[PDB]
Design a protein around this ligand. Structure first.
Ligand SMILES: [Cl-]
Ligand SMILES: [Cl-]
Ligand SMILES: [Mg+2]
Ligand SMILES: [Mg+2]
Ligand SMILES: [Mg+2]
Lengths: 222, 222, 195, 212, 4, 125, 233, 204, 196, 195, 4, 196, 4, 4
């Protein structure tokens, strides 16, 4: 994977590529690595696919219950603490590598969490196999005081570095923008720069091509 | 401990028609999750209307191709400029490979040209020099994705005559060069979609009684 | 342990099971019966890790006999086989799994059909016309693929089995000291005494 | 692989499959596992594809030189012993071969030698060799008679490879068949299991384990 | 198990 | 190693060291071989300027090479031991690899080959 | 069978319209100890070729000596040694590639990754890579070590395919190379601030710049980072 | 010693115009030895279809488990479970066994009976959902299936066309794998009829 | 890591580099390794980032609870709570921690807790991979009862050297000043400290 | 390979050697003669590593036959045994040693005595009234300790051997497919054809 | 490399 | 070990501790690690005692033979002969060697040869296990063109620190002075250098 | 894992 | 063995 997070003037933006791999094989050309923990707290996840989905839902569930119990909008630092303490307990065996971001009553926040349970704070971050390609771009173009549109460009540029230069990353760019005072906007397939070309030929077969031994109607009813 | 082998990825494919043969390979070269080059050819005109690719560990692939090219040179010097027939090339390459039986060349080798009756020929080799003539062969990283497609589309395997009750096979027949280039291009775009080590570019060498022509096509760069 | 076979013909299931018990370089016994009756129309043969085999067989036998007494009824072969499979499927993830493979041969009296189940120590169950565990299958499956017909009589079945035992005595490395053969049909379970 | 060869009343039958595997990957279904050394000599291949192919075509060159030097065709015993003495030199280096050297000479009659890469050499009437050997043995042994007609022998050989092709995951493709007589070897065709299985099932009524 |  | 080319050509196209070796044969005691319909006989003269010989132990002149082949000779006696040993070794080696004893022609061709080799190798007569 | 002791990190490089640029820092590390600081890892051969080397420094010094001996040997009985029979970059490369592959084949490698940069006599740009396995490749941009991971993606933004080379000036390309070196100093724990850079131009020839420094670094935002999550002061 | 390739076998699923197809082979072996030619890998719970490749004991166990769970679901909810929902239940159930998993590669296919939408999904052994427009593949010949599908497939096939396409992907992938084959079954699934066809294939 | 804490006339100063490593890759160049466990008790963290964060969070929690029930804890008490964690979990932890705080009775105090969970009270303490390179320097240049400016200089010069030689140290130098006057955060950038 | 025995009676040496050749789970052959005649009054049986056994035996046979031709004389059993021992004793420290064990049975015509030598692959030589290699000895030595007498006839020897083969067929794990028996006495070497 |  | 060599106004000085270890046992407390390979070319030895002795003996032999045929060898040449040995036998050698000599053309020169057999010409060089602890100190205190007395002090103070922290260093401090005036052996005992 |  |  490649994933990033970039802060800006009124908020924070995260982005991710959309490739899943099983060894050298591309298992999924368009999976969603952006997760909603709560409406205005989103997560990007790299590592063991099931682990990032499962850990993200569990903490999303408990955050919802907590938000209800306290009559407050959830804070990013609560997701952060809950995620990190869970991951630490599992000593690295839950392979989730996350960039957590969102807006809450305290402001806008950007964090990363490694699988053994350490957390980092920054204005720009990247994780995954594509993280060095992305970080090269971020270190080259990031500045203090980015506008929302600059931040989006910077983020998707960093994801693009991963897509082109990392064999662990490909296909599309997903983005999510969390601005203070506004709804999070989740931009699924924000960029689609890897559209398959038209095939040369149609492989649709003459009907009857396949040799059949038996038919029968299957009973799905009651 | 020092490991004398590496894996440079890519994939290659040979198809033989009635009076021509093709040898195609992608132009991407990789190690681990990094791209080394997007255009580094690995199919070669070796003289005497023989094309050759040796895919796997590039350093071994280059050494072998170099040695065979040199073998063609000396065949001329020692046997009064006689043409090296494809069957003779094949057998010579077996000895090149088997000579290193106890420290093998880590490559899958394919050669293509014309047999002595002017018919198209493809020969393939395992890393220590087992060999066999075929209509058809893919080799390298995406071999397992492409080969079964070729069994179906080149040798018409599992395809029957409609309405003959799966009793009369689709009858075998040579393919035009136009048809073959279509199967090659589709084979590689499919392979590029699902294998991370395949992409960037596709180079095809076509071999007829008038010599060797090349064709090049862009492939997805992610 | 080692050799256990089963063939299902028209009207019965026949189980053949080797008699030798070997530990080290000594054949300790040449008359071992590698089988337990589970109910009057269900028989189970077994092979695998020393000790584990009998302990497992007797434990299943105890459970099936308990069920019979409780409900005054005989469980169908399909039901017994599913019970056995579940037990093995649990076992495979225990601290110490049962390393036992079984063939279950039974006559279902509701259907009036003979049935043969092959189950390995992982809990892998399959219903088959003929079955074997261990290296035995490597000779018999192909032989039976050739000579077996679905509608054979019990006598035809036993001749087919003579073929299998002959081949195994010709090509197997070990002396397994012959087989004990047992027939399961509509009238219960009986043992052939000269094989 | 599955390969076999047996002696009988009417000479020698030799039958082999055509599959090559790398792990579970089916690498080819069209391998020629019989090598025709001379018009009275055959070699079968099982084990390493390269090892077998290379050393068995090397063997042919050695047999050719014998007849140039000695003005006489090489004995099966001597041809087999060249191969076995060769592989014995490489013992421990990791060569992998199970081969049968099959032929007729006037001094020997029809003769089969089993030769493998541990350096074992055995004369005998029946051998099956390869990952499918046991399957082939089961059918072959239980129908073998010294007196089989040439017609029956050819079929039994073909049928035994079919048996192994079906049950052994690492055997398949097609059957190649040979008959060896006092007059040399005669090829009896390439038989795709694709069609042969269904033909045999129908005509013989065997393979009832299979959904018809 | 797939990774990302 | 001692290298000298001792068997070389003379201006008339003769190899004198080979021709002089023939002279040594000429001086040797006589040997004759006659073949019947169904046997072969080997006769050998023994020069009779020698009494007090012990015939039990004195090297006989016909040698078994294998149990079906014999060799006799005329010339230098010590030289003949070398050829007989080499021939005997080859006979056993032929049995080991071909699984058949030597033909008489084969064994003859071998001994002949050894003799020829000594006419174009450095340092040997 | 070897293990590298004193080592040099990334070598980065690219083609531009008229030539090639190549750079590498002046550090020789000893594990995590930054042991030596005046280490030149770009070695010019003639006035048309620079060879940049990463990996084991003892093996780099060996390779220096081979190259300096090669120049000597080429001059022998060669009246066109400084003209038509001067060493080309393609000759110097193939020689190195040959040695690298032989040493891997004898199970005793030279523990290096090498980039040969220069201009052929017909004016063509030469850029090719070879390493301890004898693997070789060419691309409009090339880098070794962390360079491959961080410099390539940056340099390919400038030259992404063959056709982008005519469009790229030496000012543009030197910028990209110098910026790439800064990034590597931010992110590679075994890089130094000081480095050398060389341009081989088909018109101006070889310019070899020593004692460059990474400058215009962004560190200010560091002050705003407090704690690792919840801490405020 | 790799549990996911002791028994062998494969499953593939595809979407078409208002239909889905799901197919499997019939082999069950113990390494090189083929044991059974009748081992189906596709099951259904009402109108939702589940194919499972991998270790046969777990395939059997998981079928028994999901029958159980869907039976109780039906009793409490008073309706048949839908594919989107069943997909989620599969995921939960596998991830619950995270550090001692079932060695399986499940595949779900069916049509949502409210929305009429065709739906397919695949999972890894610990529950990761892979949803796809086009096709899902699983088993010891998965590389081959990926190759066959990626080249043969096109969107919006009619049921009788989709049948040919999925069958050809399965057959030709199986034939390049030593551990798959020995027969095959294809389910064509339309909004409310389901045809099941047994394919004729090479028996080696 | 390169970390240290130094007692002086008016209290104590903590200092650290800002580098985190994942092999030879710098995962974070602006890390904050100086952590608060109470208003005027702080620690420097070295070793595992996850272990040391988890430990500091627990200690902060214990001292918050201590405070609620018994008032301000002593620096010695804070060091004891770190020890208890590090010692009792020595098999599973890679944590080298320096604890530093300011009492009004006790002035500045420094406790260092190396890998095994032993405790050592010292005038100053250095630790982390980069510390090996400055034992010589620090032993030669430290005196007791330095001024604030002298102590900032000592720390700046020391960590400068540790960063110079250690590849696992770098970025900015952070310091935290602990006196009766409150709590002061200092930061020094490469262009300043490098050429000292 | 596996089973090789020898007994020396009053006037001969008898060698018994198993006929099976097994590789994997297949008995490839049931009529293998695990013996080579070294000279007309000396016989050698062998067992051990596949390939090594025959290669070694034939190599010794070639050397002894060469000696016979060279000197027109038959080496005594004691001499042949010492030659063989030295060959094995060299071999044990080679790059790849011969893993072969042998029994040498001979009739010494100068002494008019039969002699039996047991030599293992290390070159450990012992002269014995009766001998065995491999697991066989674990049954036969004790049996022979009981039933053997120094002055037995060749017929008494063969009956004693029937006892040994019977015991081995009762208690050995493997099917070794019977033995080929050979007698070495004053008149040379002959083979019993029904055992 | 393959086997047969 | 702790060893170093320093160039100055009039030439070069070599210094070393005198400890040899066999585990934690001190096999020799008065070792001489500064060894002559020519009248005014000497080396400091660290690593294996056997390897470094064997190497120095061979180099002394080469340079004696060089001298006989071509006159006095340069310090650079001596360092080259050490390199050739260390590089070509890198798999079998544990030798960290500093070479130092005095020409009249070249004044003082120092070449250091670490484990892999690379060569590095430097103003001064430090090496041996104890050197890690004085990188900071030495980098802070070395200047070019020091006087003899300043250079003796620099070496004395540096090795004092290395010996203090490194358990594998100790005993006496030996030095060898190399100028136009000849060759001078110095020795300093614990009671002097310890309390510096 | 990240170290310090 | 003695080290330095
Ligand atoms: Cl941290
Ligand atoms: Cl010493
Ligand atoms: Mg990519
Ligand atoms: Mg098969
Ligand atoms: Mg000390």
């Amino acid at each position: 994977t490649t994933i990033v997070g970039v802060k800006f003037n009124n908020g924070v933006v995260i982005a991710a590529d959309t490739r899943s791999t099983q060894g050298p094989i591309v298992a999924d050309k368009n999976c969603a690595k952006l997760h909603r923990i709560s409406p205005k707290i989103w997560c990007a996840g790299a590592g063991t696919a099931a682990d990032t989905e499962a850990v993200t839902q569990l903490i999303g569930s408990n955050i919802e219950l907590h938000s209800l119990y306290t009559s407050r909008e959830p804070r990013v630092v609560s997701a952060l603490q809950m995620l990190k303490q869970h991951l630490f307990k599992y000593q690295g065996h839950i392979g989730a590598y996350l960039i957590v971001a969102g807006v809450d009553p305290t402001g806008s926040h950007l964090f990363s969490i490694h699988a053994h349970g350490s957390t980092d704070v920054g204005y720009y971050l990247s994780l995954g196999s594509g993280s060095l390609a992305a970080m090269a771009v971020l270190e080259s173009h990031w500045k203090q005081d980015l506008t929302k549109e600059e931040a989006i460009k910077l983020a998707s540029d960093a994801i693009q570095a991963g897509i082109w230069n990392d064999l662990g990353s490909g296909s599309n760019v997903d983005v999510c923008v969390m601005e203070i005072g506004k709804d999070a906007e989740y931009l699924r397939n924000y960029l689609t720069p890897n559209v398959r070309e038209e095939k040369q030929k149609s492989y649709k077969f003459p009907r009857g091509t396949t040799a059949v031994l038996k038919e029968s109607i299957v009973n799905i009813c009651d | 401990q020092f490991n004398p082998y590496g894996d440079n990825g890519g994939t290659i494919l040979g198809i033989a028609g009635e009076d021509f043969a093709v040898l195609a390979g992608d132009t991407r070269n990789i190690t681990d999750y990094s791209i080394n080059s997007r255009y580094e050819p690995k199919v070669f005109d070796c003289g005497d209307n023989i094309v050759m690719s040796a895919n796997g560990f590039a350093a071994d692939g280059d050494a072998l191709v170099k040695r065979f090219k040199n073998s063609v040179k000396w065949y001329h010097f020692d046997h009064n400029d006689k043409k090296l027939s494809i069957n003779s090339a094949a057998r010579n390459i077996q000895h090149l490979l088997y000579g290193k039986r106890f420290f093998p060349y880590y490559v899958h080798t394919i050669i293509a040209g014309l047999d002595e009756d002017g018919k198209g020929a493809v020969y393939s080799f395992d890393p220590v020099g087992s060999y066999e003539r075929e209509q058809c062969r893919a080799g390298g990283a995406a071999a397992s994705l492409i080969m079964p497609f070729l069994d179906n589309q080149v040798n018409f395997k599992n395809q029957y005559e409609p309405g003959t009750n799966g009793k009369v096979k689709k009858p075998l027949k040579y393919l035009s060069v136009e048809e073959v280039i279509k199967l090659v291009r589709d084979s590689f775009t499919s392979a590029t979609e699902r294998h991370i080590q395949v992409g960037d570019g596709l180079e095809i060498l076509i071999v007829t009684k008038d010599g060797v022509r090349k064709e090049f096509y862009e492939l997805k760069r992610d | 342990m080692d050799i256990i076979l089963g063939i299902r013909v028209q009207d019965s299931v026949i189980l053949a099971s080797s008699k030798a018990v070997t530990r080290g370089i000594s054949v300790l016994k040449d008359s071992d019966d590698k089988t337990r009756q589970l109910s009057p129309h269900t028989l189970m043969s077994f092979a695998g890790e020393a000790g584990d085999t009998v302990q497992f067989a007797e434990y299943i036998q105890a459970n099936i006999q308990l069920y019979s007494i409780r409900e005054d009824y005989e469980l169908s072969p399909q039901a017994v086989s599913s019970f056995v499979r579940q037990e093995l499927a649990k076992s495979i993830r225990s601290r110490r799994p049962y390393q036992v493979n079984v063939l279950i041969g039974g006559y279902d009296k509701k259907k009036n059909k003979p049935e043969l189940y092959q189950i390995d120590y992982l809990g892998t169950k399959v219903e088959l016309p003929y079955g074997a565990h261990g290296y035995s299958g490597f000779y018999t499956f192909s032989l039976l693929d050739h000579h077996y017909r679905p509608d054979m009589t019990t006598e035809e079945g036993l001749d087919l089995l003579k073929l299998c035992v002959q081949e195994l005595e010709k090509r197997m490395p070990m002396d397994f000291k012959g087989v004990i053969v047992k027939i399961v049909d509509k009238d219960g379970i009986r043992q052939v005494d000269d094989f | 692989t599955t390969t076999l060869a047996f002696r009988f009343q009417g000479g020698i039958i030799v039958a082999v499959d055509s599959r090559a595997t790398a792990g579970n990957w089916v690498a080819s279904q069209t391998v020629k596992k019989v090598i025709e050394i001379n018009p009275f000599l055959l070699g079968t291949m099982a084990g390493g594809a390269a090892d077998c192919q290379f050393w068995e075509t090397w063997l042919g060159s050695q047999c050719r030189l014998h007849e140039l030097r000695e003005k006489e065709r090489i004995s099966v015993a001597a041809a087999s012993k060249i191969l076995s003495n060769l592989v014995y030199q490489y013992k421990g280096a990791g060569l992998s071969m199970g081969t049968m050297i099959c032929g007729y000479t006037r001094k020997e009659g029809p003769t089969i030698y089993y030769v493998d890469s541990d350096g074992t050499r055995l004369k005998g009437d029946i051998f099956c060799v390869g990952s499918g050997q046991t399957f082939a043995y089961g059918v072959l042994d239980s129908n073998y008679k010294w007196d089989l007609s040439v017609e029956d022998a050819l079929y039994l050989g073909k049928r035994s490879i079919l048996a192994a092709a079906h049950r052994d995951a690492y055997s398949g493709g097609s059957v190649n068949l040979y008959h060896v007589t006092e007059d040399g070897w005669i090829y009896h065709g390439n038989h795709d299991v694709g069609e042969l299985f269904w033909k045999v099932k129908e005509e013989e009524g065997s393979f009832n384990n299979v959904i018809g | 198990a797939x990774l990302x | 190693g001692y290298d000298r080319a001792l068997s070389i050509f003379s201006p008339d196209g003769h190899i004198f060291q080979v021709e002089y070796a023939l002279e040594a044969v000429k001086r040797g005691t006589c040997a004759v071989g006659v073949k019947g319909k169904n046997c072969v006989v080997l006769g050998c003269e023994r020069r009779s300027t020698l009494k007090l010989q012990d015939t039990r132990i004195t090297p006989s002149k016909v040698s078994k090479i294998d149990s079906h082949v014999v060799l006799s000779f005329s010339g230098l006696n010590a030289d003949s031991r070398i050829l007989i040993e080499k021939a005997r070794v080859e006979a056993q080696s032929h049995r080991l690899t071909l699984e058949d004893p030597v033909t008489v022609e084969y064994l003859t061709r071998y001994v002949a080959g050894v003799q020829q080799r000594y006419t174009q190798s450095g340092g040997v007569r | 069978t070897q293990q590298p002791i004193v080592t040099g990190t990334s070598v980065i490089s690219m083609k531009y319209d008229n030539g090639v640029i190549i750079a590498a820092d002046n550090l020789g590390s000893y594990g995590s100890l930054l042991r030596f600081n005046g280490v030149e890892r770009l070695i010019p051969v003639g006035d048309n070729t620079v060879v940049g080397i990463s990996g084991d420094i003892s093996d780099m010094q060996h390779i220096e000596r081979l190259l300096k001996d090669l120049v000597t040997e080429n001059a022998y009985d060669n009246p066109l040694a400084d003209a038509e029979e001067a060493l080309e970059p393609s000759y110097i490369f193939e020689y190195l590639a040959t040695v690298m592959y032989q040493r891997r084949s004898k199970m005793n490698p030279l523990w290096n990754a090498i980039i040969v940069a220069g201009v052929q006599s017909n004016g063509d740009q030469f850029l090719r890579y070879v390493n301890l396995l004898g693997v070789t490749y060419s691309s409009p941009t090339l880098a070794t070590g962390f360079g491959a991971h961080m410099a390539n993606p940056l340099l390919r933004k400038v030259v992404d395919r063959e056709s982008d080379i005519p469009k790229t000036t030496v000012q543009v390309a030197e910028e990209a190379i110098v910026n790439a070196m800064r990034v590597l100093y931010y992110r590679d724990a075994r890089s130094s601030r000081n480095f050398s850079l060389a341009i081989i131009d088909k018109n101006t020839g070889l310019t070899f710049k020593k004692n460059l420094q990474v400058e215009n670094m962004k560190w200010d935002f560091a002050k705003d980072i407090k704690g690792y999550g919840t801490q405020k002061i | 010693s790799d549990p996911s390739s002791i028994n062998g076998g494969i499953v593939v699923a595809m979407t078409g115009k208002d239909c889905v197809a799901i197919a499997c082979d019939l082999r069950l072996g113990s390494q090189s030895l083929g044991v059974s030619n009748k081992f189906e890998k596709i099951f259904h719970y009402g109108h939702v279809f589940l194919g499972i490749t991998g270790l046969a004991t777990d395939v059997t166990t998981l079928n028994e488990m999901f029958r159980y769970k869907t039976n109780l679901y039906k009793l409490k909810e008073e309706r048949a479970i839908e594919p989107e929902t069943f997909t989620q239940l599969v995921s939960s159930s596998l991830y619950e066994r995270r550090f001692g998993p079932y060695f399986v590669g499940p595949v779900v296919a069916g049509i949502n009976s409210k929305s009429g939408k065709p739906f397919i999904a695949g999972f890894d052994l610990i529950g990761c959902i892979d949803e796809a427009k086009d096709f899902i593949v699983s088993g010891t010949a998965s590389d081959q299936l990926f190759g066959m599908c990626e080249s043969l497939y096109e969107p919006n096939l009619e049921p009788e066309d989709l049948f040919e396409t999925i069958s050809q992907a399965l057959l030709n992938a199986a034939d390049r794998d030593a551990l798959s084959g020995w027969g095959a079954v294809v389910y064509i699934i339309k909004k409310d009829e389901v045809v099941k066809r047994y394919l004729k294939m090479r028996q080696d | 890591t390169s970390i240290m804490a130094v007692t002086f006339k008016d209290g104590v100063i903590l200092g650290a580099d800002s580098r985190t490593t994942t092999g030879a890759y710098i995962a974070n160049r602006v890390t904050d390794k100086l952590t608060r466990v109470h208003d005027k008790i702080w620690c420097c963290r070295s070793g595992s980032a996850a272990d040391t964060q988890a430990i500091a969070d627990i200690v902060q929690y214990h001292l918050e609870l201590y405070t609620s029930q018994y008032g301000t804890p002593s620096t010695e008490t804070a060091a004891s709570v770190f020890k208890e964690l590090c010692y009792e979990n020595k098999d599973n932890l890679t944590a080298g921690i320096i604890v530093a705080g300011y009492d009004d009775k006790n002035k500045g105090e420094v406790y260092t807790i190396p890998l095994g969970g032993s405790v050592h009270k010292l005038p100053y303490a250095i630790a982390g991979s980069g510390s090996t390179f400055i034992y010589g320097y620090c032993d030669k240049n430290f005196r007791e009862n330095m001024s604030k400016e002298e102590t900032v200089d000592f720390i700046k010069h020391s960590l400068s050297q540790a960063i110079k030689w250690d590849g696992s140290s770098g970025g900015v130098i952070r310091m935290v000043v602990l006196t009766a006057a409150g709590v002061e955060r200092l930061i020094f950038y490469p262009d300043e400290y490098e050429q000292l």
